[PDB]
């Protein structure tokens, strides 16, 4: 239920009060689970008061290719944490109790693992 | 304009005739632009004659609280992979997603694929 | 401020507790003003105690050609149909998507509902 | 297999060669079938000799809230056609061999019928 993820953000962040852009990938395949899927989340880190990393995301499936037309779904995530590059880093959940733990790079990298 | 991408996909696919999931991500900021902004592609890898990779993508550009439903565009896209030239005996891609792809409007890619599902590669627009 | 609505609906639900599916168009053109542009709403209906309505937006502007790549924007909203006040008795909203409802952010709609499935009304940002 | 479909669409656009903004949804439920789902296309009639509807749709399914972050599918679609109201008005076709006969209205109204 652990799966490697891996994406890029802003590492550079304008300072006028905007968010930092982000993305990051999952291909839903581990040792023990091949769901034949990935998602991408597309967002932004907000930091402030409480820190929130605010996503829209896609789910791909792969497809015959006459279904290729049912094989994405879309949706939105927003998590909370339990510099835009220590704001980043550590362990988040979201509404369905999924969890990651990033880790942000001085050169916009970001890695870590995501847990469902 | 060549930037870092990095990504994701099922190195263990269906061989029911099904296409590869995958995606990827790319920031806008290089050594000499920042765009504030990052786009993820999702969508599958389908081989054959001519392979391609079907996608959509989401673009999210950093946005102060008030602007954050403006802060998000969608779209979709498909490369295809560049193939050998006749004049080298031509033919097809060798099979898999390691290579050099580009769209319709002139944006490419190379990638090297990772026997485990990494993704690493540059984008040019 | 106030645009027109229209839309359909699922007007035979199934019973299993599942949300009634929806949609619906506004162009952002008025009497007053036009921002060349129009947003769909898709999403479902899921009534109760607090009855909402749960979307899924884009919105797309005309754009030329060159630009075609950047003109649809996504989000996502909640709306909560207004229920009556505390000193009527107060209660939760009697069941059916025709009323009033409103955004967290403020922006209100009115719709009526027809028994085959239409919908129409007036949108206020 | 005929479904009742109405929109919008910007009935007085750019004049700078820009297309002209439009949705439309319909419900796919009618006498005779009825699958609990409601599509919304968002897009632009760019006008000519093979002239095009370019969007974008959402399809979102009637689910239990459980099942809610999985109800709803995105993808794409381009028409081409067998003053945007002179235009956008007649019969239509796409990739997938779906039609629609539309009409437009001075108003900015849309209603007609699909066919999938």
Redesign the interface.
């Known amino acids: 239920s652990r799966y ?11 300072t ?14 581990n040792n023990y689970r ?1 769901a ?9 880190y ?1 930091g402030g008061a409480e820190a929130r990393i ?1 996503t ?10 006459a279904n ?9 995530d927003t998590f909370t944490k339990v510099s835009a590059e220590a704001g980043i880093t550590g362990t988040w959940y979201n509404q ?1 109790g999924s969890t990651f733990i990033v880790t942000a790079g001085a050169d ?3 890695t870590g693992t995501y847990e469902s």
């Open positions: 490697v993820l891996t994406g890029r953000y802003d590492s550079a962040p304008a006028d009060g905007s968010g930092t852009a982000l993305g990051w990938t999952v291909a839903w395949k091949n034949h899927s990935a998602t991408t989340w597309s967002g932004q907000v605010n829209q995301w896609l789910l791909t499936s792969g497809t015959t290719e290729a037309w049912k094989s994405t779904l879309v949706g939105h369905l916009g990298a970001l």
